[PDB]
């Protein structure tokens, strides 16, 4: 996003500028369920632009840059990565599991982490897998408001489970073994 905003006349190269672009992205960007058609109009008219107030009183608007940024999730080649996107990797993780597993993973595609908060991501990912998946199978995405905070929440859940109280390394075992103990006791 910083490089394409530079293309539009908004060059952000220092730390304050970088932190600001991240904030702009979080509030203005979306994935688009059809990149090329969305771009055809975003690149042609101000009607698909959204404004942002910069901290110094200046303003910026974002056009196709608004969706080209998250598009890298579907097209990693945008940043120089040799990859077909997060939906191909999701597809392969389902496909590479045993044949009696595949049906359950297709129906339980879980979005987690941040960036899951770009509008349309929960739906585009179901579309992209459905397009690769066999027919008959149900493809479904799980995308709760507990998105981006799901790892922390999982930590809270796990730390407090009765089924997890035997998984903790105590500060006894730790000193006898040293920190390498984590590879035997945790994961």
């Amino acid at each position: 996003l910083m490089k394409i905003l530079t293309e539009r006349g908004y060059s952000f190269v220092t730390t304050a500028e970088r932190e600001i672009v991240r904030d702009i992205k979080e509030k203005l960007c979306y994935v688009a369920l059809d990149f090329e058609n969305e771009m055809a109009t975003a690149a042609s008219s101000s009607s698909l632009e959204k404004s942002y107030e910069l901290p110094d009183g200046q303003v910026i608007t974002i056009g196709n840059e608004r969706f080209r940024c998250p598009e890298t999730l579907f097209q990693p080649s945008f940043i120089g990565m040799e990859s077909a996107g997060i939906h191909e990797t999701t597809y392969n993780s389902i496909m590479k599991c045993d044949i009696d597993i595949r049906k359950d993973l297709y129906a339980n595609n879980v979005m987690s982490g941040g960036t899951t908060m770009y509008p349309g991501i929960a739906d585009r990912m179901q579309k992209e897998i459905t397009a690769l998946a066999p027919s008959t199978m149900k493809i479904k995405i799980i995308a709760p408001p507990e998105r981006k905070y799901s790892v922390w929440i999982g930590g809270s859940i796990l730390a407090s489970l009765s089924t997890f109280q035997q998984m903790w390394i105590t500060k006894q075992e730790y000193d006898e073994a040293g920190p390498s103990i984590v590879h035997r006791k945790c994961f």
Binding site: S156, I157, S160, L161
Partner: protein, 56 residues
């Protein structure tokens, strides 16, 4: 002259009737395992909100 054909046709029938009667008596005496069951569902129509678990 026909006494033996009568007796022989009858012996065959009595044995066949015996063998069929034995499997038929069990077929008719008990018949629950040969039937079926409701196999009902959950639905969760009373699920008006989240559960007490940290996972819900």
């Amino acid at each position: 002259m026909q006494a033996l054909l009568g007796a022989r046709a009858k012996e065959s029938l009595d044995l066949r009737a015996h063998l069929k009667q034995v499997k038929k008596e069990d077929t008719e005496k008990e018949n629950r395992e040969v039937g079926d069951w409701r196999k009902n569902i959950d639905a969760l129509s009373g699920m008006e909100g989240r559960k007490k678990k940290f996972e819900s």
